Design a protein around this nucleic acid. Structure first.
Ligand SMILES: [Mg+2]
Ligand SMILES: [Mg+2]
Ligand SMILES: [Mg+2]
Ligand SMILES: [Mg+2]
Ligand SMILES: [Mg+2]
Ligand SMILES: [Mg+2]
Ligand SMILES: [Mg+2]
Ligand SMILES: [Mg+2]
Ligand SMILES: [Mg+2]
Ligand SMILES: [Mg+2]
Ligand SMILES: [Mg+2]
Ligand SMILES: [Zn+2]
Ligand SMILES: [Zn+2]
Lengths: 114, 77, 177, 66, 82
RNA sequence: AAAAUGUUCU
RNA sequence: CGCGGGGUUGAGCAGCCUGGUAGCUCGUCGGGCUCAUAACCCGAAGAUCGUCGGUUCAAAUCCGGCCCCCGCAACCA
RNA sequence: GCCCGGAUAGCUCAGUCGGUAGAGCAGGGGAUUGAAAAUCCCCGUGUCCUUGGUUCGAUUCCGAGUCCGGGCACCA
RNA sequence: ACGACCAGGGCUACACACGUGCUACAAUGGCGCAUACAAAGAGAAGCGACCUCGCGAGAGCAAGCGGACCUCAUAAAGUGCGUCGUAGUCCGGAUUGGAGUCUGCAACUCGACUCCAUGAAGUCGGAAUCGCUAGUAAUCGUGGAUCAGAAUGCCACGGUG
RNA sequence: CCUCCUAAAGAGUAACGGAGGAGCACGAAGGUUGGCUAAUCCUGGUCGGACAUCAGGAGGUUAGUGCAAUGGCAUAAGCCA
């Protein structure tokens, strides 16, 4: 049960199972399923090889898994290089998107030390 | 011993102490700048500013080694 | 076996064409592929080590030599003569098969793969790589694995220069970067 | 090789999705159904595509068009 | 951010100044206050001294800085540490 | 059972 | 400079006690209780174990030297 | 080899003449108090020290030894 | 000049500590489709049906209504089927990358909302501590004010209970 | 009691001379037969780091010897079976 690199859960329903792939969430999974011609309810158990192949192909059509990671990462790197406000934020480990830092930055800040 | 003591005192004093027209880069004043520590110009025999990515401009003193290197690498900054 | 067959007739010929060697013995040949799983953290438990060994065996159909510590170090908390790794020296038909598997089947299975490192040849012609996740070999069953394990593959060859070795590798497909 | 205590090493039939039937000696036991091989996996096209991405001016132009 | 129908914003004065600079090709960093302005392709190569409230931080305009606003490369707050 | 204290001048 | 003992988290003590596990009380810091500080309650951080060599797989631990301390004996004419 | 005291739950200790796990304390939770003590409930965790053997298996009962305490006696 | 005008910046900073909220940790739940039942409000530089385009935020045309008429505006919990079967999960939505939409001279600092992707912590919370006696708490939504835009806040409204 | 030096190139050789060790250990760490060759260094390579394990080259006994030191030890007296 491999698709676009990584393994997919054998028991889980396709819509959800697909979501395991980095670069597909729910909507994209659904789209993929539609493209294939498969229902959402079916599992990877009771799913044919030919059927799988089509799905895989569909997935390939999107920028997914390692490629996506490479892209996003690259963007971040570029930003950092630029030294744009966003870049600066990224470098510091502070909220990029314009949040308060006085309090509640703990995701990007990390778990508080003192 | 006395001399040593005096020296110590002086050091202490120094420590205690420690505790924008300036550089008009190219006919436009009030540009974010700073003196570089490689060689620090005051009334020096001309200066040159490297337009950095962050922290604005770094003034180098004209005929510096670092500045020369920078020029060699890329003259447009 | 297939790979070996290919080599004798094609790869060697290619090498001859490109480098202009005097003899057919002068062409680089892969001498041994030496797999290594230096488990290390098996100091806590030997079951882990055993598992690793098993995995290695599965990957490459020999049974590994459990290499012990040569000298003691307290940084990793090991003694001399502690089972602290396992190796599989492959040679001949089996080795060839393994190589084929790696190049034709297993390297394609590498996660986030954009080719190998060409700048990794030791100086004296011999290549080495290392797989992050040992699942990439289809010999391992994903349901059975308990540890995110890995190994290093090591293609030793008769090549004098690194360049020659690289060429040889290329002749056996090998994507590089 | 020392008999008995090695694993079994049969010439199985690996068969990927893109019609490359591949007979190899392994210790899986069962016949193998692969995704990708050397004659399909993108280390030629993928590389090309990844490279062709970066650009800002072009994007700007597209956005605006004059 | 700004709508695609509305067209990417640039301060008029800066646009004019930039044009002049490009026309001449004379270098010499442009004093700018309008930080709210998308950098253009024509702005690449120039140095623009973007205000940060206090001073005009000189940004050398790279090819990668285009769709960004000027103020992005001109940090207003000067924080180091606590 | 155990519960101390409240800076000065207004 | 002869004999022993010691130097460890800010303080005091354990550990050393026969190398590989840094603990106890007070203090500190952040909460809480209170009107507020105490006391009390909860959570947390803290240590190249005098220093320098050495032995070692590795030292706080064993050994040497040096630095400071505390005992001590320094006598018979 | 003279005698006699002590080896279990995390720690300190009781105990069946062949079929099982029990106290006070520590630890978890709760009840209680305005708060904290002292309560008081409740669960909890143990190859009964290891290994042969009698036998239906057996902390239980036999064969097999270290460590500390006190006394007495040997020792070229 | 401690007066006045302007541009930009700041009031949104961030080792950190406290307060008040929201969202959670899930199965009394989520997700999917079908379907029922509110009240109260607001609205002409406004509210903006229907129709078309847009996956969607929204865009285009554009009636109606100073409004028991028209609009905001399909209430949501609920109910009926299906699915997931106790997982850091189809829980959770932080975060961040990309693409966008709207407002407004202007969304970089620094708006909201959308889409796709990403999918932190968190598995009911130490000491301590607050609210509430009935249509109350709890929970579910809906409106308003200010407001170009921008509420988990505030002020109201009903549902379940 | 052992090792070095002192000790004057046989032995021996004193000092409250200068240095360190022993009061054992091992039924394999002994016997033998067969085999193997080190420390370190470079480049490379899953987590893996200055330091585990694996490739090869340099290195050539710098190591090892159950423990002190000295003298020995590749024919190895070192390390495997
Ligand atoms: Mg995903
Ligand atoms: Mg202003
Ligand atoms: Mg404020
Ligand atoms: Mg309104
Ligand atoms: Mg969800
Ligand atoms: Mg977690
Ligand atoms: Mg009342
Ligand atoms: Mg509003
Ligand atoms: Mg002599
Ligand atoms: Mg003589
Ligand atoms: Mg290395
Ligand atoms: Zn200089
Ligand atoms: Zn294939």
């Amino acid at each position: 049960a491999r698709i676009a690199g990584i393994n997919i859960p054998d028991h889980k329903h396709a819509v959800i199972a697909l979501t395991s792939i980095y670069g597909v969430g729910k909507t994209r999974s659904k789209a993929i399923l539609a493209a294939a011609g498969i229902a959402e309810d079916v599992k990877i158990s009771e799913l044919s090889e030919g059927q799988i192949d089509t799905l895989r192909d569909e997935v390939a059509k999107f920028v997914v898994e390692g490629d996506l990671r490479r892209e996003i990462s690259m963007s971040i790197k570029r930003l950092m290089d630029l030294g744009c406000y966003r870049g600066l934020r990224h470098r510091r480990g502070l909220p990029v998107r314009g949040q308060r830092t006085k309090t509640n930055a703990r995701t990007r800040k990390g778990p508080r030390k003192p | 011993a006395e001399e040593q003591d005096a020296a110590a005192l002086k050091q202490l004093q120094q420590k205690s102490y420690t505790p924008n027209g300036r550089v008009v880069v190219e006919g436009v004043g009030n540009l974010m700048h700073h003196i570089a520590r490689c060689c620090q110009p005051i009334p020096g025999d001309e200066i040159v500013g490297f337009i950095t990515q962050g922290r604005g401009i770094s003034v180098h003193r004209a005929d510096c080694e670092q500045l020369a290197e920078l020029r060699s690498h890329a003259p447009e900054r | 076996a297939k790979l070996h067959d290919y080599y004798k007739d094609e790869v060697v010929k290619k090498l001859m064409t490109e480098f202009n060697y005097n003899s057919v013995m002068q062409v680089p040949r892969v001498e041994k592929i030496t797999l290594n799983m230096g488990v290390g953290e098996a100091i806590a438990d030997k079951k882990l080590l055993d598992n690793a060994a098993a995995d290695l065996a599965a990957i490459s159909g020999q049974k590994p030599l459990i290499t012990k510590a040569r000298k003691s170090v307290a940084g990793f908390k090991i003694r001399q003569g502690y089972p602290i790794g396992c190796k599989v020296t492959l040679r001949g038909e089996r080795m060839w098969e393994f190589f084929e598997r790696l190049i034709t089947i297993a390297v394609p299975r590498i996660r986030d793969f954009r080719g190998l490192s060409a700048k990794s040849f030791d100086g004296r012609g011999n290549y080495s790589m290392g797989v992050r996740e040992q699942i990439i070999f289809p010999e391992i069953d994903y349901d059975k694995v308990d540890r995110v394990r890995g190994l290093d593959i090591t293609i030793t060859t008769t090549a004098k220069s690194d360049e020659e070795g690289r060429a040889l590798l290329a002749a056996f497909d090998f994507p590089f970067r | 090789m020392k008999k008995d205590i090695h694993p079994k090493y049969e010439e199985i039939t690996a068969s990927c999705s893109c019609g490359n039937v591949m007979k190899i000696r392994s210790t899986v036991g069962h016949d193998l159904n692969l995704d990708v091989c050397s004659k399909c996996h993108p280390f030629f096209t993928g590389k090309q595509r990844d490279v062709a991405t970066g650009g800002r001016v072009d994007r700007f132009n597209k956005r605006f068009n004059i | 951010p700004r709508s695609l129908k509305k067209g990417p914003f640039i301060d008029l004065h800066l646009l004019k100044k930039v044009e002049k600079a490009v026309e001449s090709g004379d270098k010499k960093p442009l004093r700018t206050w309008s930080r709210r302005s998308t950098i253009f392709p024509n702005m690449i190569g120039l140095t623009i001294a973007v205000h940060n409230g206090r001073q005009h931080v000189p940004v050398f305009v790279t090819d990668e800085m285009v769709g960004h606003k000027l103020g992005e490369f001109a940090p207003t707050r000067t924080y180091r540490g606590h």
